[PDB]
Amino acid sequence: ADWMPGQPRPSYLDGSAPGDFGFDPLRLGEVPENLERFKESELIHCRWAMLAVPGILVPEALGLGNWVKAQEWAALPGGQATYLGNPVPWGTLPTILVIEFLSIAFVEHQRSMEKDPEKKKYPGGAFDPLGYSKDPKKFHEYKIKEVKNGRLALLAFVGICVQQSAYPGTGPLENLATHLADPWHNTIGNVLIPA
Amino acid sequence: MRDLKTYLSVAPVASTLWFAALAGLLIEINRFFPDALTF
Amino acid sequence: LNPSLVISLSTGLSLFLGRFVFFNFQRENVAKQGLPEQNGVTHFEAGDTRAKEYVSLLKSNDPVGFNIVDVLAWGSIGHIVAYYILATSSNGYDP
Amino acid sequence: KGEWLPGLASPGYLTGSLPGDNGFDPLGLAEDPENLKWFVQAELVNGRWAMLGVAGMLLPEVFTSIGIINVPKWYDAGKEEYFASSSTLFVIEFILFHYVEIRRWQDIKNPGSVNQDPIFKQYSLPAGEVGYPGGIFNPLNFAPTLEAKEKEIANGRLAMLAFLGFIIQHNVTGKGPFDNLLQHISDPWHNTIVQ
Amino acid sequence: DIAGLTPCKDSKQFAKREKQSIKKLESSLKLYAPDSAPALAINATIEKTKRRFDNYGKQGLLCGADGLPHLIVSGDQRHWGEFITPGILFLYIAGWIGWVGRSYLIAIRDDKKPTQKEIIIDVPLATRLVFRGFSWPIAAYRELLNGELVAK
Ligand code: CLA
Ligand SMILES: CC(/C=C/C=C(C)/C=C/[C@@]12O[C@]1(C)C[C@@H](O)CC2(C)C)=C\C=C\C=C(C)\C=C\C=C(C)\C=C\[C@@]12O[C@]1(C)C[C@@H](O)CC2(C)C
Ligand SMILES: CC(/C=C/C=C(C)/C=C/[C@@]12O[C@]1(C)C[C@@H](O)CC2(C)C)=C\C=C\C=C(C)\C=C\C=C(C)\C=C\[C@@]12O[C@]1(C)C[C@@H](O)CC2(C)C
Ligand SMILES: CC1=C[C@H](O)CC(C)(C)[C@H]1/C=C/C(C)=C/C=C/C(C)=C/C=C/C=C(C)/C=C/C=C(C)/C=C/C1=C(C)C[C@H](O)CC1(C)C
Ligand SMILES: CC1=C(/C=C/C(C)=C/C=C/C(C)=C/C=C/C=C(C)/C=C/C=C(C)/C=C/C2=C(C)CCCC2(C)C)C(C)(C)CCC1
Structure with missing residues (x-):
């Protein structure tokens, strides 16, 4: 097993699946049909966090709004969503709320009707315009690069969420700023060890 | 004597x-450290 | 908020969803777990004469078979979503 | 091999093979061979840390008393101010030990399975006994002889006893270990468990 | 403080209770000559009463409106002496008794007439097993890990 040298890997994880480093200490994927669903579910999680982590960091580096401040314009009656400074001419709460439900539910239900298991996770066609999946050897290389970047993104999202939990209101980049103030005092040590 | 040691080992006697x-x-222990409620 | 606009937009979308986007899935699942059975046999087949499926109502000349029960079902969800939006906007709740 | 109690039948699982066998397991803690295997490693690691700590506790106090250095007493050194917060120190101590001890662990579970560098994969420990990694951990290439292992274990057992003494002696006398010794040398027959 | 209580060392009803208690014993004390055996005895109870109340105050016990100590067993670290600590001691001793007890039934289970060592204790055998209890957590965990503790 690569994920923990000297540890025997589960017998159903042989390293062929992209990102199969033999990690499954609870043996969740011992039921083969669950393993395949879990493969699909992991990629879906990976691709969302890979979109979100830029979305959480890029606007904080730029104009006002850490990923939590970008959401406090709703809730309280009023509604004045601003994209890149300009208040978008439709950024009221019920407008995007319906648009989000209708658009996301439609494309998510469409995803669920695919019967083929390999197209459930690697559909291709329109979503592979540049033909990156044409080469079978190169196809599998990008499969691993996808899952590894996606697991890193999921890991970053957890940090973002857990950091927010510890320093409410702050943003992840402000956390890094506060860290670089004096790294030997502004650490997770304060969180793990109060005062 | 060995009969006596066997009897002395019978359930009630040993109890x-x-x-x-x-x-x-x-x-x-209660004469030396009385009224212990904590520990 | 215009009540007629909210109600008829909600019902419109719900009816649209049930006819064009969710129809196959709902039909597939009804076929999957079909009529209720007692000891391996439908209630009607067991003698519950009052348990006869009303094929007359279920008939429809709609291309996909969207019938009057579908209109009642998806039309009900629309009216429920509509009146949730109307009542929720009628108050001045602050979280 | 040795007898901790002349004329007393050694436990039959203590066969003269392990360095430090003096027949001492009167409570039978180690009759199961897998307990024995684990307790051997546990004695090595407790004895090695005791030797480092007891040296770090006693010897600095001796050199302040002489006047060549001036360092806090061991039970005061936590109070001092250091370039980094003590909670910061703990987090890095946890992370570094977590890596290093899981690695020691793997080799107990699966001897040899973790002797090679995972990053610079051309470097490796040579094959050896568990609890005695050698190679770069023995840069002066001392022969890990039976005598050396027996001296290692004797010194570890003595330091473990001494550490036990430092702890009990401090919570009884308030002072430090070299202080208790100097006070005892003064007039021994009156300061000897009269506290 | 915890659960609206106050430390017994600050509690007025706690102090009242000690006072009413000593006054009770002194009403009996005044019956007897000061050298007499009853006077010494009642005085011994009085000193023990005084030791007890100061001891509960110094151990950090919380008191209620009743003036009586109330134990905090939630896990709170100021009150481990009220449950966690004597409880660990109980489990250590209880497991010792049970592990020794099982050692004896196992030791005699393959004997000729096993019920004979159940009504007539083989005391020599028992003196040899009595100290297996010292390490029951390690021994019981070890029999688990290698299929010896439970039958299939
Ligand atoms: C070797 C001794 C021994 C051991 C290890 C156990 C172990 C167990 N018993 Mg059992 N039990 C025993 C003796 C023992 N019992 C005796 C003598 C009786 C008759 C009173 C019972 C009656 C009994 C009942 C009614 C129940 C248990 C239950 C249980 C289980 C849960 C714990 C419990 O409720 O304890 C309870 C313990 C008792 C009620 C009394 C036993 C305490 C005695 C004093 C210990 C044995 C002393 C023995 C003489 C030692 C001699 C050894 C010496 C020669 C070296 C656990 C498997 C419960 C269960 O099945 O849960 C799943 C349950 O419902 N037991
Ligand atoms: C990390 C988490 C998954 C972690 C699960 C792992 C650890 C499980 C590990 C194990 O199971 C294995 C593998 C094997 C078992 O044997 C053992 C265990 C240990 C059980 C998924 C998070 C998944 C997180 C993803 C899905 C979140 C996507 C969020 C996006 C939509 C956010 C968008 C926005 O953030 C922007 C962009 C801007 C903001 O202003 C507004 C909002 C809307 C907030
Ligand atoms: C780990 C070791 C101590 C290491 C301590 C070091 C790191 C201290 C580091 C620091 O000091 C510095 C340098 C600087 C200070 O400012 C701070 C601290 C942080 C304090 C003690 C182990 C101490 C180990 C103890 C003493 C082990 C004793 C167990 C023995 C007695 C068992 C005997 C028997 O078990 C047998 C063998 C078999 C059975 O049959 C019979 C019985 C009788 C049960
Ligand atoms: C491996 C390596 C490899 C390479 O190659 C080579 C080399 C380098 C050689 C190596 C290294 C090694 C080293 C590290 C060693 C260390 C050791 C020490 C630490 C010991 C201590 C050791 C320790 C010791 C014993 C301890 C002892 C102690 C004592 C008894 C004490 C006593 C005391 C008491 C109690 C108390 C009082 O009051 C005081 C006193 C009196 C004082
Ligand atoms: C033929 C045709 C057509 C037509 C159709 C239409 C136009 C439809 C309509 C329909 C509709 C329009 C429907 C409706 C429905 C409705 C319903 C079905 C409702 C329900 C309701 C409910 C259920 C309610 C409830 C409630 C109440 C009562 C109170 C309050 C609360 C609530 C809300 C819950 C078209 C042109 C398209 C196409 C071609 C063909």
Whole structure:
């Protein structure tokens, strides 16, 4: 097993699946049909966090709004969503709320009707315009690069969420700023060890 | 004598001796360290 | 908020969803777990004469078979979503 | 091999094979061979840390008393101010030990399975006994002889006893270990468990 | 403080209770000559009463409106002496008794007439097993890990 040298890997994880480093200490994927669903579910999680982590960091580096401040314009009656400074001419709460439900539910239900298991996770066609999946050897290389970047993104999202939990209101980049103030005092040590 | 040592090992006899010893021990701990509510 | 606009937009979308986007899935699942059975046999087949499926109502000349029960079902969800939006906007709740 | 109690039948699982066998397991803690295997490693690691700590506790106090250095007493050194917060120190101590001890662990579970560098994969420990990694951990290439292992274990057992003494002696006398010794040398027959 | 209580060392009803208790014993004390055996005995109870109340105050016990100590067993670290600590001691001793008890039934289970060592204790055998209890957590965990503790 690569994920923990000297540890025997589960017998159903042989390293062929992209990102199969033999990690499954609870043996969740011992039921083969669950393993395949879990493969699909992991990629879906990976691709969302890979979109979100830029979305959480890029606007904080730029104009006002850490990923939590970008959401406090709703809730309280009023509604004045601003994209890149300009208040978008439709950024009221019920407008995007319906648009989000209708658009996301439609494309998510469409995803669920695919019967083929390999197209459930690697559909291709329109979503592979540049033909990156044409080469079978190169196809599998990008499969691993996808899952590894996606697991890193999921890991970053957890940090973002857990950091927010510890320093409410702050943003992840402000956390890094506060860290670089004096790294030997502004650490997770304060969180793990109060005062 | 070996018959007597067998009898002294019978369930009731071994029990009183065991529990007598136990009671003496607990009584003396309570005479030396009385009124212990914590620990 | 215009009530007629909210109600008829909600019902419109719900009816649209049930006819064009969710129809196959709902039909597939009804076929999957079909009529209720007692001891391996439908209630009607067991003698519950009052348990006869009303094929007359279920008939429809709609291309996909969207019938009057579908209109009642998806039309009900629309009215429920509509009146949730209307009542929720009628108050001045602050979280 | 040795007898901790002349004329007393050694436990039969203590066969003269392990360095430090003096027949001492009167409570039978180690009759199961897998307990014995684990307790051997546990004695090595407790004895090695005791030797480092007891040296770090006693010897600095001796050199302050002489006057060549001036360092806090061991039970005061936590109070001092250091370039980094003590909670910061703990987090890095946890992370570094977590890596290093899981690695020691793997080799107990699966001897040899973790002797090679995972990053610079051309470097490796040579094959050896568990609890005695050698190679770069023995840069002066001392022969890990039976005598050396027996001296290692004797010194570890003595330091473990001494550490036990430092702890009990401090919570009884308030002072430090070299202080208790100097006070005892003064007039021994009156300062000897009269506290 | 915890659960609206106050430390017994600050509690007025706690102090009242000690006072009413000593006054009770002194009403009996005044019956007897000061050298007499009853006077010494009642005085011994009085000193023990005084030791007890100061001891509960110094151990950090919380008191209620009743003036009596109330134990905090939630896990709170100021009150481990009220449950966690004597409880660990109980489990250590209880497991010792049970592990020794099982050692004896196992030791005699393959004997000729096993019920004979159940009504007539083989005391020599028992003196040899009595100290297996010292390490029951390690021994019981070890029999688990290698299929020896539970039958299939
Ligand atoms: C070797 C001794 C021994 C051991 C290890 C156990 C172990 C167990 N018993 Mg059992 N039990 C025993 C003796 C023992 N019992 C005796 C003598 C009786 C008759 C009173 C019972 C009656 C009994 C009942 C009614 C129940 C249990 C239950 C249980 C289980 C849960 C714990 C419990 O409720 O304790 C309870 C313990 C008792 C009620 C009394 C036993 C305490 C005695 C004093 C210990 C044995 C002393 C023995 C003489 C030692 C001699 C050894 C010496 C020669 C070296 C656990 C498997 C419960 C269960 O099945 O849960 C799943 C349950 O419902 N037991
Ligand atoms: C990390 C988490 C998954 C972690 C699960 C792992 C650890 C499970 C590990 C194990 O199971 C294995 C593998 C094997 C078992 O044997 C053992 C265990 C240990 C059980 C998924 C998070 C998944 C997180 C993803 C899905 C979140 C996507 C969020 C996006 C939509 C956010 C968008 C926005 O953030 C922007 C962009 C801007 C903001 O202003 C507004 C909002 C809307 C907030
Ligand atoms: C780990 C070791 C101590 C290491 C301590 C070091 C790191 C201290 C580091 C620091 O000091 C510095 C340098 C600087 C200070 O400012 C701070 C601290 C942080 C304090 C003690 C182990 C101490 C180990 C103890 C003493 C082990 C004793 C167990 C023995 C007695 C068992 C005997 C028997 O078990 C047998 C063998 C078999 C059975 O049959 C019979 C019985 C009788 C049960
Ligand atoms: C491996 C390696 C490899 C390479 O190659 C080579 C080399 C380098 C050689 C190596 C290294 C090694 C080293 C590290 C060693 C260390 C050791 C020490 C630490 C010991 C201590 C050791 C320790 C010791 C014993 C301890 C002892 C102690 C004592 C008894 C004490 C006593 C005391 C008491 C109690 C108390 C009082 O009051 C005081 C006193 C009196 C004082
Ligand atoms: C033929 C045709 C057509 C037509 C159709 C239409 C136009 C439809 C309509 C329909 C509709 C329009 C429907 C409706 C429905 C409705 C319903 C079905 C409702 C329900 C309701 C409910 C259920 C309610 C409830 C409630 C109440 C009562 C109170 C309050 C609360 C609530 C809300 C819950 C078209 C042109 C398209 C196409 C071609 C063909």
